[PDB]
Amino acid sequence: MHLNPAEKEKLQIFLASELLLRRKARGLKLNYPEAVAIITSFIMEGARDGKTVAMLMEEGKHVLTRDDVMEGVPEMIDDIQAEATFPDGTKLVTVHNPIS
């Protein structure tokens, strides 16, 4: 596979998102790390899909809403940052105030 250090780490984000998504699906309000994991994995998968940085900056604000998360979680998350390989190489996506 030739995994480098970041590829190994970032597998854990995908896993945490899968965990969080299962928790959401059984009706739980998500907590801080769960919410971050879901939005982060969404960004990385979006890059893999070939979306632009600008698309993901916009879409990332609509992945979870305040009713999906516990009290205070929206205010705990000022932004979520993630780097992934786009068709044009690694880029940084910052989603500002992802959950209103």
Binding site: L3, N4, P5, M57, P87, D88
Partner: protein
């Protein structure tokens, strides 16, 4: 008996006139010459040539022209050439490039490249071998950054920092004698070569100089500490006395001066201009004009390399995030629009291709990616071939001229700039055996094996529980060169002459090889291999358009790069 070329290349790697594609780029390198004697190629294994009385000599002791290590059948890509040879290593240094084996029975054996009882073998047939990358713009922020660098073929980190302190997150600076001592001690555990930069700030000489005497290998002037005329001047006076290099991130704000004022303070003295395009910092908008001057050694950092469709969006926001700017402060918005400029980023691609920007670097973790200096160098070269065509200098078919121009940017040139090219930065006899093997399909993307001081330090290798090392998962892993006290012998801490003379290594109990920084003050742009062009670069203050020899330098951003989604899991 004759062997067809396809079969020959499959068995021994390519020979004279054969070409090899670099990863999934459009770039082809051609074997220029070959040191072998056809029929007497060295190889190792069951029934192969390097066996006692045959290709291995059974008579000579280690001291008697025998090697510690032979890399067989390497395709060398280096500023010195693109060519096929065996590489011989002894006492951790490259001692021979030529033809290894046994003079008993083989023709054409280089006299000090005897394979004997003492000799280990690495098979490099079908591999491209380069010097280890020399990254001269490293922020020491997170120790996990070292493996990231090794995995993309970097073997020397020059820069500064104390971990994730704000000073270090902004600037390549380890400030003052105590922080320098502490980080020299930390370096004993980092499996990579290191040199540390002190704070190039002050209005008196002594506070700056005491950093050099404490063990710093250079200085960094950074606008976040005040890139004023005084700090510039004092740093260069210190550097001229101490024979170390100064790197600069200039006054973006033009607070105390414009570019011309910084150049006046420099006063013709040698300086390394970091992220010379300026998205990474410097006099807005015209910093890149530095790269035209004969006393400037100009480098890029990697996030602008090359110009792509996501670059601007990404940087405008990256800048906003890491400088804690607000969209509702008009000054901050105007600042970002003055600093992140497609006009200068596009011109930067071209300036690299022209040999006007001499070096690449990361800016690891402070607007730059620790494991993408080598990667983005080749993506730039590929984009330039596609957009500008083969360079006029190419001999039909191949991209050798471009490949030598671009490999120099991350190997020999940063080493020359930093005063360490006597030790590292190229595959040459007499230099430290920091070598990177690449499978051509992964060239510039993921290193196969990284050799440090003659022992493998990092490798893409599989299941440690398996019968053989190739089963999954194949991942980058630290090897025996990083374990125990071998980490001391396989890596170099580069230090100032004065700190070495004053016994700092003994005082601090440093066990690593100690490298001396020297010959930094008597060089210039002319000394940058394959990248020695001086010219008047004009940057229009209204439009940011860049002109050289009266021609606007512009190119388009690309939507796709090679060395990208074919390879990476994320």
């Amino acid at each position: 008996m004759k062997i067809n070329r396809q079969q020959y290349a499959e068995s021994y790697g390519p020979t004279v006139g054969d070409e090899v594609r670099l990863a999934d780029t459009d770039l082809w390198i051609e074997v220029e010459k070959d040191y072998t004697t056809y029929g007497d190629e060295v190889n190792f294994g069951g029934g192969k040539v390097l066996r006692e009385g045959m290709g291995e000599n059974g008579t000579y002791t280690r001291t008697e022209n025998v090697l510690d290590l032979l890399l067989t059948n390497a395709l060398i890509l280096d500023y010195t050439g693109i060519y096929k040879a065996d590489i011989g290593v002894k006492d951790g240094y490259i001692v021979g490039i030529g033809k290894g084996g046994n003079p008993d029975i083989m023709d054409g054996v280089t006299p000090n490249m005897i394979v004997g009882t003492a000799t280990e073998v690495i098979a490099a047939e079908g591999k491209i071998v380069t010097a280890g990358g020399i990254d001269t713009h490293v922020h020491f922020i997170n120790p996990d950054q070292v493996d990231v660098a090794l995995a993309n073929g970097i073997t020397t980190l020059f820069g500064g920092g104390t971990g994730p302190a704000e000073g270090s997150k902004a600037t390549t600076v380890t400030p003052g004698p105590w922080n320098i001592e502490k980080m020299l001690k930390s370096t004993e555990g980092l499996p990579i070569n290191v040199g540390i930069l002190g704070k190039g700030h002050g209005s008196s000489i002594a506070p700056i100089m005491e950093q050099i005497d404490a063990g710093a290998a250079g200085l960094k002037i950074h606008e976040d500490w005040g890139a004023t005329p005084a700090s510039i001047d004092r740093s260069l006076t210190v550097a001229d006395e101490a024979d170390v290099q100064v790197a600069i991130h200039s006054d973006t704000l033009n607070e105390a001066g414009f570019l011309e004022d910084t150049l006046r303070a420099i006063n013709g003295r040698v300086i390394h201009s970091f992220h010379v395009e300026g998205a990474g910092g410097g006099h807005a908008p015209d910093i890149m004009a530095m790269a035209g001057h004969p006393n400037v050694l100009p480098s890029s950092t990697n996030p602008t390399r090359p110009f792509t469709v996501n670059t601007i969006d990404e940087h405008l926001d990256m800048l906003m995030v890491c400088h804690h700017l607000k969209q509702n402060i008009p000054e901050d918005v105007a600042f970002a629009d003055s600093r992140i400029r497609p006009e200068t980023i596009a011109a930067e691609d071209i300036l690299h291709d022209l040999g006007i920007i001499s070096m690449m670097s990361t800016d690891a973790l402070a607007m730059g990616r620790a494991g993408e200096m080598v990667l983005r160098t080749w993506q730039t070269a590929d984009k330039m071939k596609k957009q500008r065509g083969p360079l006029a200098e190419e001999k039909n078919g191949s991209d050798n001229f471009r490949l030598k121009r671009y490999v120099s940017k991350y190997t020999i040139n940063p080493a020359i700039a930093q005063g360490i090219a006597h030790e590292v930065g190229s595959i040459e006899e007499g230099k430290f055996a920091d070598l990177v093997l690449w499978e051509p399909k992964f060239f510039g993307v993921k290193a196969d094996r990284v050799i440090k001081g003659g022992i493998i330090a990092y490798a893409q290798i599989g299941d440690p529980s398996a019968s053989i090392p190739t089963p999954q998962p194949v991942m980058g892993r630290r090897m025996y060169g990083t374990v125990g006290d071998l980490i001391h012998d396989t890596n170099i801490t580069f230090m100032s002459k004065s700190s070495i003379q004053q016994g700092v290594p003994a005082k601090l109990g440093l066990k690593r090889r100690i490298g001396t920084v020297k010959n930094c003050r008597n060089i210039g742009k002319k000394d940058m291999k394959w990248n020695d062009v001086t010219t008047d670069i004009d940057i229009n203050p209204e439009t940011y358009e860049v002109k050289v020899d009266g021609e606007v330098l512009t190119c388009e951003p690309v939507k796709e790069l090679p060395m990208a989604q074919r390879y990476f899991l994320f």
